[PDB]
Each structure stands twice: as structure tokens, then as C-alpha cells.
Design a protein around this ligand. Structure first.
Ligand SMILES: CCCCC[C@H](O)/C=C/[C@H]1[C@H](O)CC(=O)[C@@H]1C/C=C\CCCC(=O)O
Lengths: 216, 211
């Protein structure tokens, strides 16, 4: 199959910036009829992909002129001249020349802002959940930037990997930050058989993790 | 105007099959190709195959040959994607797209497919209170299906709120919501999370009180 390689994986931009996204195919995508079926799509959360450019360089109807596509052979580029807020989202390239048709992995265009360490908060199981026989420990890692972050749970100093579920928000409309929730779920029996619970946040803003804990 | 109407969201029992529909209008049905595209939550797009109702010709991405079957009803301008023996990996949005040969495609809005054996179940709502600003939260656990609506103080508290996407585990959804307020506002004033679940026709409130 034709592999479509998109770079960069993510591109931070300020409004009004120039933006340029690359898509490279692993082999030629010239169809036997002579055409090159290379398309660019923009997709926002909860919506279908919207077609921006078709056949390499042709702007689809209703698409603002600030979008333009170019390329030849295995080498393709999408440019945005003066990025606006509605341009933020994930961009995909698609080759339609050789079956199976294949997409690039996507490039996220996101709003640039100052780096910001997460605000980390940890919460023991509620009495109500314990009564019901369950035990969930919740850690919020809020309003950080950039989006990459890692969380580690420690029970009595020991790293726990099972029973952890994570969720991430989309970039905040007001402060351009990201947030993450991490939940460690145990039986009540096992929760009461330990003392210290710890969530550790590793983020680019520091060399040392932000560590938050409570002791039963 | 070329339009594609996809069927509504599907809740599918594990192991069962589901048949999704894409009904077209605004062009000669037998002269356009229909493609199906899969997108798992938070992931990219994956091409399933193409189908040409006008001849019954088709091609499947090898990755989907044992999973997908394309059919059509020319009498209703509808193409179908049947997915067999569903697993958690089949939970995704499925888009249909239509185009004439050498012309640009039009995409449907997509159909959400969720695999679970759960019946309709209201959420258990648990307060998250701490052990200048203070962060509080609510854990919304064990419900089915999506969605729920979470507000704080009946909507009056909207700044500083983060409601996280739900995660399906053991056939049921769980989500959390956090809110951050000045320390001089809580616990001195009331902070309450409100959780509505349309499918079970329920709405519950949980006041956050100090531990
Ligand atoms: C989600 C995919 C949307 C469509 C992408 C792209 O616009 C389509 C490209 C088409 C082109 O119009 C003709 C062609 O051969 C490409 C591949 C599609 C179907 C195969 C037809 C083979 C046959 O005729 O037998």
C-alpha cells in the first residue's frame, strides 16, 4: 500500500501566521489516467472531514482563498496564508490514485501560547462510592501547555499501571491550554489495604515531576 | 444539491452485526461511487472500500475483507455497510462519501457505532472534595449510553470548568468534571454539580462538602 507521511505531527501557530504542512507518499501517486488524486481535508472535533483541496492544487468550492495546495510526484504541501481561528483542527491528506486509498496520520494545527505547568489535584474516593463498595482515585492535571504530558500512579511508593483510565480535553477556547483527568479504580478491599496514593505529572515545563499525594 | 443521509447512532451488542445506511439524493444514484471510511475515537481516518451501485462492483481494503460487506438498494438510492461480529475495535464513526469518476467527493455526517452489552443505566454521581484557588470535581460513573450533561450550580458556574470526555470500560461510561473557584467562595458558598442523563430521563445534584 501507499504510505502517506505527514509532517509535522503538530504545528503551533498564532493567528495571522503563515502555515505550511507537508505530505509525502512512499511511491508515485499518478493514476493511469494521468491525474493525481491527492486531497487535503480539515476536520474539527465531532464533525466530518471537510474537503479543502482536490487534485493537488484545486481549491474546493466555498473554501477561503487563504488555502492553497501544491506538489508533484511524491511531494505535496498545503499552505495557509494568515491563519484564522476556524482553521484550527486536524489536517489529513488522502491519495486516491492507487487502491487501497490511504490517508496521512494527520497534522494538528493548534494555537500557540506560553508554556504552562499543570495544576495537579488529587482526590480520594468519596464516602458514597466506598459505601457502594467501589474505590476511585481521581487526579486532575489542568491548564497546561503544550499538550504532551505523562501521568504515573504510585501506591505505597509502588508504580501501578492496571485500572488506570485517562481522558484529555481539547484546547481551551479561552486560555488555549489543555487538561487531563486520570482515574485509578480499585476494589474497596484493596483500597483500604494501602496508605499513600500518588499521582505524578511529567511535563516539559520541569525536569522533576509534579507530585501530588494523600495518605489514608 | 448532492446530499448523503447516514443512519442514526447505533448501539450494538458485542458479537452481533450491524447494517449502516447511506441514502443519496441530488444525482443519478447508479453513476457515483460510494466509499466508507472508519474513524476510531481520537484516531485518524481509515479507508474501508469502494462500491459502485450502477454495476455492483466493489473493492475492500484487505484489512476489512472479513469485517465489511457492501450492498445497495437501487429502489431507494441507498448503499449499506454491514459490519459483522463486532468487537471493541469496531466502535467508531463510519463516514460514507460519494463521487462521480474524476470528480470531487461529498461526505456524509457519519454514523457512530458503539459496542456494548449494557442496558440503559443512569450514572452514579460522586463528589470530589480535597483531602488561593481550590479545585473541586464530580465523578460520573457507570452509565449507558452517551451523553450526559454536567453543569455546576445549574450553569451559573461556567468559568474554570473542565468536563472530560467519557471513557467506556466494562460496557459502561465514566467521566469526571472539575471546577476551580476562589478559596473565598468554597466551602463558604454552595458548589453543586448537576448531572442529566437523557436516556434514563434522570437528573441528579451533588453538593460538594468538605471532608
Ligand atoms: C473517501 C474517498 C473519497 C474519494 C477520493 C478521490 O476523490 C477519488 C478518486 C477516484 C477517481 O475519481 C477515479 C479513481 O480511480 C479514484 C479511486 C476511486 C475508485 C476506483 C474506481 C475504479 C473503477 O472505476 O473501476
Amino acid at each position: 500500500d501507499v504510505l502517506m507521511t505527514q509532517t509535522p505531527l503538530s504545528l503551533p501557530v498564532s493567528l495571522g501566521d503563515q502555515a505550511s504542512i507537508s505530505c509525502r507518499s512512499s511511491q508515485s501517486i499518478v493514476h493511469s489516467n494521468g491525474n493525481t488524486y491527492l486531497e487535503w481535508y480539515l476536520q474539527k472535533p465531532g464533525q466530518s472531514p471537510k474537503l479543502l483541496i482536490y487534485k493537488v492544487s484545486n481549491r474546493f468550492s466555498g473554501v477561503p482563498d487563504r488555502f492553497s495546495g501544491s506538489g508533484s510526484g511524491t511531494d505535496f504541501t498545503l499552505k495557509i496564508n494568515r491563519v484564522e481561528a476556524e482553521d484550527l483542527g486536524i489536517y489529513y491528506c488522502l491519495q486516491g490514485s492507487h487502491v487501497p486509498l490511504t490517508f496521512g496520520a494527520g497534522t494538528t494545527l493548534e494555537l500557540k501560547r506560553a508554556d504552562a505547568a499543570p495544576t495537579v489535584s488529587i482526590f480520594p474516593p468519596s464516602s458514597e462510592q466506598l459505601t457502594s463498595g467501589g474505590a476511585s482515585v481521581v487526579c486532575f492535571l489542568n491548564n497546561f501547555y503544550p499538550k504532551d504530558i505523562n501521568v504515573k500512579w504510585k501506591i505505597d511508593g509502588s508504580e501501578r499501571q492496571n485500572g488506570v483510565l485517562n481522558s484529555w480535553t481539547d484546547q481551551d477556547s479561552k486560555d488555549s491550554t489543555y487538561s487531563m483527568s486520570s482515574t485509578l479504580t480499585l476494589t474497596k478491599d484493596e483500597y483500604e489495604r494501602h496508605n499513600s496514593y500518588t499521582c505524578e505529572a511529567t511535563h516539559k515545563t520541569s525536569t522533576s515531576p509534579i507530585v501530588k499525594s494523600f495518605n489514608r | 444539491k448532492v446530499q448523503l443521509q447516514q443512519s442514526g447512532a447505533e448501539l450494538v451488542k458485542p458479537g452481533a452485526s450491524v447494517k449502516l445506511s447511506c441514502k443519496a439524493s441530488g444525482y443519478t444514484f447508479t453513476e457515483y461511487f460510494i466509499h466508507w471510511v472508519k474513524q476510531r475515537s481520537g484516531q485518524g481516518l481509515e479507508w474501508i472500500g469502494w462500491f459502485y451501485p450502477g454495476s455492483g462492483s466493489l473493492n475492500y481494503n484487505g484489512k476489512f475483507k472479513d469485517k465489511a460487506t457492501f450492498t445497495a438498494d437501487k429502489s431507494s438510492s441507498t448503499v449499506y455497510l454491514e459490519l459483522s461480529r463486532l468487537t471493541s475495535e469496531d466502535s467508531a464513526v463510519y463516514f460514507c462519501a460519494s463521487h462521480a469518476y474524476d470528480k470531487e467527493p461529498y461526505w456524509g455526517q457519519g454514523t457512530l457505532v458503539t459496542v456494548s452489552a449494557a442496558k440503559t443505566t443512569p450514572p452514579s454521581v460522586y463528589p470530589l472534595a480535597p483531602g488561593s484557588m481550590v479545585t473541586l470535581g464530580c465523578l460520573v460513573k457507570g452509565y449507558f449510553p452517551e451523553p450526559v450533561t454536567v453543569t455546576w450550580n445549574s450553569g451559573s458556574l461556567s468559568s474554570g470548568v473542565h468536563t472530560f470526555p467519557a471513557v467506556l470500560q466494562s460496557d459502561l461510561y465514566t467521566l469526571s468534571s472539575s471546577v476551580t473557584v476562589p478559596s473565598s467562595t468554597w466551602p463558604s458558598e454552595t458548589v453543586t454539580c448537576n448531572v442529566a442523563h437523557p436516556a434514563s430521563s434522570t437528573k441528579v445534584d451533588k453538593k460538594i462538602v468538605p471532608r
